[PDB]
Amino acid sequence: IVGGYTCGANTVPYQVSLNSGYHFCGGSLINSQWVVSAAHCYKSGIQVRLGEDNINVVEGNEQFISASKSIVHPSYNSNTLNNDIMLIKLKSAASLNSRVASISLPTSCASAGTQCLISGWGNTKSSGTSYPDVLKCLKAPILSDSSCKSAYPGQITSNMFCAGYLEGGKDSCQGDSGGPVVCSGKLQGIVSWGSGCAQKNKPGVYTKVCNYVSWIKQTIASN
Numbered sequence: 001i002v003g004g005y006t007c008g009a010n011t012v013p014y015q016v017s018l019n020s021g022y023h024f025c026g027g028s029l030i031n032s033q034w035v036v037s038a039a040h041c042y043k044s045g046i047q048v049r050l051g052e053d054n055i056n057v058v059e060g061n062e063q064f065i066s067a068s069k070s071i072v073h074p075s076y077n078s079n080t081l082n083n084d085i086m087l088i089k090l091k092s093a094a095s096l097n098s099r100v101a102s103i104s105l106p107t108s109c110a111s112a113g114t115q116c117l118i119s120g121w122g123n124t125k126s127s128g129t130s131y132p133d134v135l136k137c138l139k140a141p142i143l144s145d146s147s148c149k150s151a152y153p154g155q156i157t158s159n160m161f162c163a164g165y166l167e168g169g170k171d172s173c174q175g176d177s178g179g180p181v182v183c184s185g186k187l188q189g190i191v192s193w194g195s196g197c198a199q200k201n202k203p204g205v206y207t208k209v210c211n212y213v214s215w216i217k218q219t220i221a222s223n
């Protein structure tokens with residue numbers, strides 16, 4: 001997260017860190033046994049880490065649970081990143097409490113202008129590199145589809161939306177990948193892609209979660 005702020009320990013209870021010996025992606029807990037992330041975050045041997053703030057220090061509220069199965073969206077295209085969403089099932093159900101909680105799925109899509117909360121342990125520099133140990137937060141508005149498409153001609157599909165600032169300076173970045181974009185207590189987006197970080201006229205692009213609720217629910221009900 002570039003140009004954001006320190007969230008505060010466990011203030012984003014649904015935020016998870018996907019670990020394969022090191023943090024490599026964010027994720028969102030949607031129930032005691034499932035996590036939603038980006039398909040481009042796929043890899044084997046994933047351990048889901050819940051209740052995390054400083055990912056390099058055991059602070060007392062963590063729950064480390066290995067993933068038993070990963071399900072990449074049936075239509076995920078790694079070249080265009082269309083349908084950049086993946087479900088991860090935990091080998092054991094997480095113990096839900098005030099610091100480890102699930103985030104609700106949307107009942108309807110959000111609109112341009114809606115203020116949302118984006119979070120993650122990704123790079124904090126627009127130029128250069130610096131990874132934080134504690135969770136970072138950024139409040140940002142969803143941008144109109146027209147402005148998004150104008151920012152990225154020929155690349156924005158109906159399963160994507162832009163959020164952030166066209167002026168730059170505040171955006172998601174490498175490491176935040178797969179993380180949440182929550183608006184009014186609902187998971188509306190997943191950190192998917194962009195061009196560089198916090199660059200002018202290059203806002204972050206996110207997977208439009210509302211288009212996948214049917215698939216998520218049906219998949220969870222049978223796995």
Ligand SMILES: N=C(N)Nc1ccc(O)c(/C=N/CC/N=C/c2cc(NC(=N)N)ccc2O)c1
Binds near residue numbers: 024176195197198
């Ligand atoms: N675990 C692997 N080895 N795979 C892996 C997993 C996740 C990964 O992301 C990558 C690799 N990522 C390359 C860089 N992605 C930047 C990026 C930018 C933004 N936003 C922006 N405002 N530009 C959002 C998301 C992003 O990923 C490789």
Ligand SMILES: [Ca+2]
Binds near residue numbers: 052055058062
């Ligand atoms: Ca920790």
Ligand SMILES: [Cu+2]
Binds near residue numbers: 174175177
């Ligand atoms: Cu990436």
